[PDB]
Amino acid sequence: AMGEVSQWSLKRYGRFMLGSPTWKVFESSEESGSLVLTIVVSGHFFISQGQTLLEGFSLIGSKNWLKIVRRMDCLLFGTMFRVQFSGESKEEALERCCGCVQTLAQYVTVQEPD
Amino acid sequence: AMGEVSQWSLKRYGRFMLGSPTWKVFESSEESGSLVLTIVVSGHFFISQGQTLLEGFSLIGSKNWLKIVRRMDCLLFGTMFRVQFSGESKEEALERCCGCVQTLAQYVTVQEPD
């Protein structure tokens, strides 16, 4: 909303968990609540579903420990979690994703797949 | 949730608006959604109701332009908005308020009423 934050809505978020599941996958539901990726101008990164914070860390000095890769409208974050931007079409999601890459890339490099 | 943020729930938030209302008052409802005051470790301050950001600014260098006053379990913010912390009792609300004052006071001074 503000000029202090940028925000993008997500279709999905998945936490690498490593019985023993590999992923815990969160989706934007009417009940569950909507997924938002937030980047604050000081360089803080959050993912939130409604009001619970699923992810929260500084992007400052993340060159040292953080790896981001984009495949189309998804980002993978490693050192692990995975995010997919929403939209009514593949273009609209991709356009969301790219806008976010633009702010993310101010702090880290966003690589292409290996 | 994280170690990157502190969060407190609010009973009420009121925006000074100056037909011509003086205040717009937001409350924690089941429909409307719950009020959260968030302070991020880089010094960013937010109030949010569900996922809408009602307030968002930096506390860094706010000594120059920002005035905070505490009356019991409420804070008034001027240069204007007003916040009241929640709790099952007056003590619990006051205890919430004070915890927040403790992080706020790292950036600004929190005055007593005039």
Numbering used by the authors:
A (entry chain B), B (entry chain B): 13 to 30, 47 to 107, 115 to 149
Paper text:
Programmed formation of DNA double-strand breaks (DSBs) initiates the meiotic homologous recombination pathway. Meiotic DSBs are catalyzed by Spo11. Several other proteins are essential for meiotic DSB formation, including three evolutionarily conserved proteins first identified in Saccharomyces cerevisiae (Mer2, Mei4, and Rec114). Here, we show that mouse Rec114 is required for meiotic DSB formation.
Then, using limited trypsin proteolysis, we identified a stable fragment (residues 15–159) that was suitable for structural analysis. We determined the crystal structure of this REC114 N-terminal region at a resolution of 2.5 Å by SAD using the selenomethionine (SeMet)-substituted protein. The final model, refined to an Rfree of 30% and R-factor of 25% included residues 15–150. Unexpectedly, the structure revealed that REC114 (15-150) forms a PH domain, with two perpendicular antiparallel β-sheets followed by a C-terminal helix. Several residues are disordered in loops between the β strands. Mapping the conserved residues to the protein surface revealed that both β-sheets contained exposed conserved residues that could be involved in protein interactions with REC114 partners. In the crystal, the PH domain formed extensive crystallographic contacts with a symmetry-related molecule. Indeed, this interface, judged as significant using the PDBePisa server, buried a surface of 764 Å2 and included several salt bridges and hydrogen bonds formed by the well-conserved Arg98 of β6, and Glu130 and Gln137 of α1. When injected at lower concentrations, the protein eluted later and the molecular weight diminished (21 kD at 5 mg/ml). These results could be explained by a concentration-dependent dimerization of the PH domain with a fast exchange rate between monomers and dimers that co-purify together during SEC. Several conserved positively charged residues in the two β sheets, β1 and β2, important for the interaction are not present in REC114.
